[PDB]
Amino acid sequence: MNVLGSRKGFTPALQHNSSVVVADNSGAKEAVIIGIYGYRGVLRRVPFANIADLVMVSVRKGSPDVRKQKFKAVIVRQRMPFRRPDGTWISFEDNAVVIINPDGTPKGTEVRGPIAREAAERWPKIASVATMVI
């Protein structure tokens, strides 16, 4: 939303039908990557996603009122080894996303676990309720 003109993107992480946890207080707990915004691909190359990407998933485990529903989020946690511009390598023990409202602000009001610095700039609303940033 605000920083993607910089080095928005890193080594390949995820794919369609990839399952991630919901790290907030929204009510959703488990979600599967259903689609990728923006990206355009080529023959047989599965579409991509990593940290700080407008991503589209659906609710698999969570409150019934959100079960089997469509919502937007951003990617905050990945297991991939990758190289930061200052040449450090960051990883997250699992893969998590935070659901965002269609305007851009997160739907949830709480944040679970650390987030790589990159998401905060691309989504300052996330940084608004962000607790710790790595």
Partner: protein
């Protein structure tokens, strides 16, 4: 900057940050160290090629 496991000197531009939910930091000289915790759980003390031997 010291390895979480072998603790030895980390010559710059390598290693990997495996950040947990707690925000703790894990530093590995190579793959040997990373396996030493994330999957081996073996004792750093139990061996004698890390300074934490005794």
């Amino acid at each position: 900057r010291q390895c979480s496991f072998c603790g030895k000197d980390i010559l710059p531009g390598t290693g990997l940050m495996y950040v947990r939910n707690d925000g703790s930091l894990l530093w590995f000289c190579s793959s040997k160290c990373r396996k030493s915790m994330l999957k081996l759980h073996r004792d750093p003390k139990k061996l004698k090629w890390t300074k934490s031997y005794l």
